[PDB]
Amino acid sequence: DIDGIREPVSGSLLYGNNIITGAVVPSSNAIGLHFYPIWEAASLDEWLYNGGPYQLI
Amino acid sequence: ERGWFDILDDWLKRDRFVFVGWSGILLFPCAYLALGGWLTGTTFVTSWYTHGLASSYLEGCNFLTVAVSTPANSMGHSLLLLWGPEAQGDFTRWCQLGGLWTFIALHGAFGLIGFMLRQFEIARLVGVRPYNAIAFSAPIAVFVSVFLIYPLGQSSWFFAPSFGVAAIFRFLLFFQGFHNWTLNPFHMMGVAGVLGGALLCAIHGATVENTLFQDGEGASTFRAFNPTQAEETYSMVTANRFWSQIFGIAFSNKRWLHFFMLFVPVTGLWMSAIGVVGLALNLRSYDFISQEIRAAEDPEFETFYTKNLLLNEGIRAWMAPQDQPHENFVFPEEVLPRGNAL
Amino acid sequence: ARRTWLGDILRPLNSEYGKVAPGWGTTPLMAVFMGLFLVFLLIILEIYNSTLILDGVNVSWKAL
Amino acid sequence: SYPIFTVRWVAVHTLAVPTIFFLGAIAAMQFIQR
Amino acid sequence: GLPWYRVHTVLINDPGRLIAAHLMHTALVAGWAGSMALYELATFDPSDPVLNPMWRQGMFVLPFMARLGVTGSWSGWSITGETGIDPGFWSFEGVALAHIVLSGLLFLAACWHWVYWDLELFRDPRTGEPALDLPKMFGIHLFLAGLLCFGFGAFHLTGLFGPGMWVSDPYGLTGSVQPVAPEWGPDGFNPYNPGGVVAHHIAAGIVGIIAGLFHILVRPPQRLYKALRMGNIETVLSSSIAAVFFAAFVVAGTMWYGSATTPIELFGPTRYQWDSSYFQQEINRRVQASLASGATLEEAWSAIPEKLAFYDYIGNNPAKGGLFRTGPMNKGDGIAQAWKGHAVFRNKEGEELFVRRMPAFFESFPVILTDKNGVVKADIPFRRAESKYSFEQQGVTVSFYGGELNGQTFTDPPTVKSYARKAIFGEIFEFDTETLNSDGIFRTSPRGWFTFAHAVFALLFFFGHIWHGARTLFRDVFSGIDPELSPEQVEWGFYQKVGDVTTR
Amino acid sequence: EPNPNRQPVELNRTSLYLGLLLILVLALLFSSYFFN
Amino acid sequence: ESANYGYKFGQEEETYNIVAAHGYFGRLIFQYASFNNSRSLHFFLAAWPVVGVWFAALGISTMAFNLNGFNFNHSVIDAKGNVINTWADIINRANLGMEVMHERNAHNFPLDLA
Amino acid sequence: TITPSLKGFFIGLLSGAVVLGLTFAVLIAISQIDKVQR
Amino acid sequence: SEGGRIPLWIVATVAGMGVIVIVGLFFYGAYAGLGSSL
Amino acid sequence: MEVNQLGLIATALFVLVPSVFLIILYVQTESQQ
Amino acid sequence: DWRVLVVLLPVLLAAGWAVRNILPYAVKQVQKLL
Amino acid sequence: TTGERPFSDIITSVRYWVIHSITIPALFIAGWLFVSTGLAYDVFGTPRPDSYYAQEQRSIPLVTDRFEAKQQVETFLEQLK
Amino acid sequence: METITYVFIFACIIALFFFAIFFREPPRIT
């Protein structure tokens, strides 16, 4: 959910992307500039929905 | 056999401040006319009758917004010769009809031919290999494909790039909105060639400058070089170790290094040229069909590819009526694609 | 090398390697034909381009 | 000693002369009012 | 050893094996022509030259056979719709077969010339070294080409002894292979006069014969020989490549703009016919003619041939495809089945409205309806909340005349809007999208692909010309510059004339 | 008789690496468009 | 053979003639536009793209604080006050397309202020 | 018939010939005057 | 007459100042009259 | 995803034919004395 | 058109003046090369 | 060196400046006049600020025919009263 | 299938990095 409007954008190959369209998607607009490490999430599923991998990377 | 041809040859190849050569006969007038044409046009000539645009200093444009604009779409691919059936020898009308655009593009084409011929000619006189000319084939491919072939594939010269800073920016944005040119693997190869070339330029220059031998006492290291010296001025061995250890691999062969510096940007430009030749026919890399099938059926499926298409659709609808005045597009507000609020 | 019947027949056709006419030879003549050719090309180009428009020459599918 | 009128002289002036003329023109344009 | 990119240079001083390599190349190309023809014949549907002609089916070599008079299959059909025809041996299959057999023969000949490379013929009589007299070879080959050119024009194209060529009416309705008389006046240089093609091959043929004799009999001037390095076969490579990219640009252009040698029934319509509404104008002219003769609207439009209507549709525009949208046009919008008839849109006041047609530039286009004066009268709104011109507000209806929907009128907004959406593409057709599993996305025609391939190859061959010309003129420094290059030869003023040591 | 024009061909290891990198990267680039 | 074999890694002597390259390039343009000094040449090769890309980076970094590109939208006006379009205005039309379509569901208020 | 554009064609042709002709006339004249020493 | 009399630094300075004047004039022109948006 | 199935073989050959070319050239280079 | 002579007159007085100053050296150069 | 007088030699000579302190301002003034007399407008066919539109018109005088383009422009220019 | 293809090509490239770095032709000073 890059823009924080509960409209998830698919970035990975397994979820329908090729090399050209694929991406690691920026963390959610609801997060803004907040620091969002894995341990700030209630679960990995949450962390992934909100685009945590982007910040880690 | 010292006839007039050989005497003329003598004179043309004199060692003067500006070398002329046989090639100069083609090069200097055409280059001068293309340049002078652009300066004249951008200073004094309008695009009112062809585009509905002011485009000259005289009209109040600045360096970023002046242009020599393409002719009206109704001119087709007319050569727009001054003595041609459209201008009929009238300089003023010719200017108003966009004759300067073909003037500049054509004298420019032959000027480029002249410059490459000059590279060959001087190479041959001095005794070096003609790799500079060969490398110059890439700018010529770019020019020819973008300014000649591309509009020749389209309806008219109108859709060629106009000769101006902002005019070219428009050309870029147009290619995104209509051609999805960023998606084109040929453009992508061009980008790799250009950024990779800039990269090589920087890394080679920097490497040389930071592996210099101390061949002098001064803190300014520039003085410690003599053009006729036999020795290398920097350490290839140290350079090689540094890069092997920093980055894993390194050049070890200087000739290959400099050949590679020729090869990368030249090849990139040639690839981009091929892509534009495709766009001449609207043979675009516009879509991924699998993406469209999935997205058409599945309204929760979204990628950066579909997002970008929405952007292109915006570009087309919002810029087409003013950018293509001859089409007389009347797009009522209600048909304009817009997201919420904006 | 190896001789053949066909090879012996053709031998004269490949026997004047490097033979030239002195000096400029027929170059002026050549230059004249090249000039003519350039004008010819110019003509068919400008006809195709509708820069040159001739009576009875309608550059269109509606020619026939 | 040196010649005055050379290929370089010509090359310099074919660029220089119009350049000054144009700079005058553009300078004048700065005072045009709509 | 040789770098990988130089492996073929072993042929430069080996005329026999050069000939073998050329033979092998020729065998490969003939083999490709044969195989390609067979594949096309295996996939071609001859059953509807009206709505499923060859250019809809991705046929590339079929039109080139058809162009010069091969129009029939041994199986009894012809591309013009006749059945029960006997094409003789020179059917499509016959041509393909002939090319395959030629390929085999050339292959065998290539082996022979590879093995028996050391023929006396290839040695200079005086020196015993390999040598080709390129000036005389050029004369010989140019003479042959002149003969062939002349014979092609005088016998084949005229039908004097041969079939002629594909000719058609200006709207590509009634095309067939016909004998063509040469046009000897200025209209011979009109690209749309086929008579000009004939005249060209006769005249250029004769000129080629004369010039051939000349190049056989008259040696090169010493100065041109030196200047062009005529003793070096690579000079011939350089200039031949130049001639070839010249030719390639020309055929790309005539394929894209159209000419007598690129008929729309063989390669499809041009983009410019859509740009200028070329077919729409003829359609309207015919309909107006019928109305003027007292016919009803339905009669006027029903009299329009489906073939004509089908030309007036943007899905046949070669500028509507994509680089990676592969295959025949049928794979996109489908296999055309029938003209639905001409859609006439009216608003509640009974004004006729006209859909704004899609320009070739646009992947997508809004649906906008104007009156005859160009005033916007209806549209399909994006934002509904301040819509003023919706079909629902304006009471837009569509009536069809001619085609399968002749006499019908639809009034429900969704249907009317469907038809308006189709109407931006021009005339509306029923398509079979199931058979090929068509995806609904436009593909370009063989005109498009031919043009693309050849512009690209022309452009790359320019580089070939530059490379080999450079190699020819700079052979002496190919491996590097003189180790003993005197600094004063390259420094300024030392010589009066650059690179001329006699001018110090 | 043996042809005197025959030459040995070479491809060094660095050229193999460069070439392989070229082919694999080109494939990585074009594959999306081939699958489309 | 490949010309590359003419250079051997670690050899002390230069593998090309900079004087010949200079003679050539100097004649291509004019003598004083060509580098005879390899150090100053290679410095130039380093400096140009590095400085350029520094400016590119600074562009992104300062537009990060919304000091944006030149705006000449409706800069040219005729005697009556009619807007005379320039290429800047066409650019603006394209920009408007991008602006109104991007993140189509994310804005509730009329100005996109970040 | 001489169309206006055919006339225009001949004018362009003659213009070119005059330009090239003057150029080479001047070039040959200068080349003859200012010879190289050998 | 004889080359070298007027010191090159003075020439450079005067030239530079001329350039500054003319470009200054153009930037002034961005805010006045045509192209000023007013 | 409804990709074009020929993509697979198109990619495979695209990788394999030239790679193999290089490999042949390289190995016979190494086996030369 | 008076504006044509009005615009050309400065350039003509310029060319004429430079000719005034440079004529003896120019004749010296033409004499020397001949 | 290629024989021509060094530029530093020339541009610091008094004679150079005697000549060019005249020829340069003269050219500048000629360009200035070329605009200020309005001659540039007429030469290149560029609209003056009051000549882009007729008083009430807001439509562009766009050229729409190839061979009648000249006549079209002349007509547009006539229509400016 | 596409995914497998993409990832495979990618994996080959990483392998190539490995060999190009650790099993390179040693540069040898002469």
Ligand code: CLA
């Ligand atoms: C010197 C190199 C050079 C070259 C290669 C070009 C090339 C061009 N010029 Mg440029 N030009 C030049 C110098 C050059 N110019 C100079 C010095 C000037 C200032 C005078 C100009 C001023 C100029 C203008 C104002 C225009 C051009 C235009 C053109 C284009 C069309 C030219 C054409 O059709 O000529 C055709 C003529 C020839 C090719 C001459 C060939 C001569 C043959 C070989 C000999 C036979 C002639 C025969 C004896 C004559 C018989 C006449 C009889 C039938 C009555 C072409 C790109 C036009 C353009 O760009 O429109 C877009 C245009 O309007 N040029």
Ligand code: CLA
């Ligand atoms: C006597 C009667 C006669 C007649 C009726 C014809 C008729 C014709 N000739 Mg033939 N010809 C004749 C005698 C005749 N010829 C003789 C005696 C010779 C000498 C052997 C020729 C040599 C000749 C040549 C070389 C060509 C013709 C062509 C033609 C065709 C011209 C129409 C066309 O489509 O042009 C289309 C082609 C052009 C208008 C030429 C384009 C020139 C290009 C623009 C030059 C620049 C190319 C440039 C490098 C491209 C890159 C730039 C670009 C990418 C932007 C027409 C069929 C042309 C043709 O075959 O067309 C298919 C052609 O190229 N003729």
Ligand code: CLA
């Ligand atoms: C032996 C006789 C022969 C005959 C009768 C045919 C007949 C045919 N061939 Mg086949 N072909 C042959 C040999 C032959 N071929 C050989 C030896 C090869 C291997 C090179 C081929 C490879 C081949 C391919 C790849 C294709 C064909 C195709 C065809 C069909 C279309 C021909 C066409 O459009 O040409 C067009 C040819 C030209 C336009 C040639 C013009 C040559 C240029 C203009 C000459 C310029 C240089 C010249 C020297 C200039 C000097 C001229 C002078 C007079 C001034 C037709 C059935 C097409 C087909 O339909 O396949 C099924 C096709 O795609 N052929």
Ligand code: CLA
């Ligand atoms: C002149 C060349 C040419 C042209 C114009 C055509 C045209 C056509 N072919 Mg034919 N064909 C050809 C040669 C050609 N063919 C050859 C040589 C073969 C044998 C392989 C075939 C075998 C063939 C088959 C089996 C089929 C066709 C079909 C078709 C039709 C559909 C084309 C399509 O979808 O392309 C798609 C085009 C692309 C996807 C573009 C590819 C671009 C490449 C990948 C660029 C490569 C990049 C490169 C690696 C970069 C290097 C960089 C490096 C140098 C640094 C079309 C009419 C189809 C048809 O409809 O038949 C009825 C069909 O099934 N063709």
Ligand code: CLA
């Ligand atoms: C008539 C056409 C023609 C012919 C006969 C030649 C012949 C030659 N070229 Mg030239 N060249 C040409 C056109 C031609 N070239 C074109 C159009 C270009 C621009 C792309 C070049 C650019 C070029 C360069 C840069 C070089 C040569 C070199 C050579 C020489 C060695 C070639 C070799 O060993 O490759 C061996 C090639 C391989 C082992 C594999 C190549 C695979 C290619 C890249 C892709 C596959 C293509 C496919 C099989 C067929 C597609 C055909 C297409 C036309 C449809 C040989 C004399 C070399 C040379 O001068 O040596 C001293 C050299 O360095 N050529």
Ligand SMILES: CCCCCCCCCCCCCCCC(=O)OC[C@H](COP(=O)(O)OC[C@@H](O)CO)OC(=O)CCCCCCCCCCCCCCC
């Ligand atoms: C002093 C101005 C600094 C400007 C920014 C930095 C430029 C130099 C750094 C480039 C980095 C490249 C990578 C290392 C490259 C590298 O190794 O450099 C090496 C090169 C030579 O080094 P030396 O040791 O001989 O000299 C540096 C010190 O040791 C002092 O002697 O250094 C220089 O030439 C410094 C020049 C300073 C003066 C430069 C002025 C440039 C400004 C010109 C105006 C530009 C304005 C553009 C506006 C559009």
Ligand SMILES: CC1=C(/C=C/C(C)=C/C=C/C(C)=C/C=C/C=C(C)/C=C/C=C(C)/C=C/C2=C(C)CCCC2(C)C)C(C)(C)CCC1
């Ligand atoms: C077109 C034409 C022609 C031609 C003309 C000409 C040839 C012209 C020229 C012209 C010219 C030749 C002009 C010039 C101009 C210039 C200018 C206008 C300049 C400006 C500059 C400036 C402004 C500067 C700036 C700067 C920079 C850039 C950087 C550094 C800093 C500074 C600031 C200094 C003829 C007649 C043949 C024919 C018709 C058409």
Ligand SMILES: CC1=C(/C=C/C(C)=C/C=C/C(C)=C/C=C/C=C(C)/C=C/C=C(C)/C=C/C2=C(C)CCCC2(C)C)C(C)(C)CCC1
């Ligand atoms: C021996 C013999 C025989 C047989 C023969 C045969 C059987 C043949 C076949 C042949 C063939 C069957 C051939 C084929 C060929 C083919 C080819 C040669 C192809 C090529 C292709 C290409 C080259 C392509 C390329 C590409 C691609 C792939 C992609 C896209 C791009 C391009 C297009 C580039 C007979 C009995 C007759 C008799 C005598 C003996």
Ligand SMILES: CCCCCCCS[C@@H]1O[C@H](CO)[C@@H](O)[C@H](O)[C@H]1O
């Ligand atoms: C609700 C739809 C009623 C009107 C029918 C749609 C316009 S026409 C329709 O268009 C399809 C392409 O989308 C074709 O595949 C099909 O053959 C054709 O019937």
Ligand code: OEX
């Ligand atoms: O997030 Mn991504 O993009 Ca920077 O503006 Mn606001 O926010 Mn969104 O809208 Mn526009």
Ligand SMILES: [Ca+2]
């Ligand atoms: Ca006012």
Ligand SMILES: [Cl-]
């Ligand atoms: Cl977005």
Ligand SMILES: [Cl-]
């Ligand atoms: Cl908001």
Ligand SMILES: [Fe+2]
């Ligand atoms: Fe270097």
Ligand SMILES: [Mg+2]
């Ligand atoms: Mg102002």
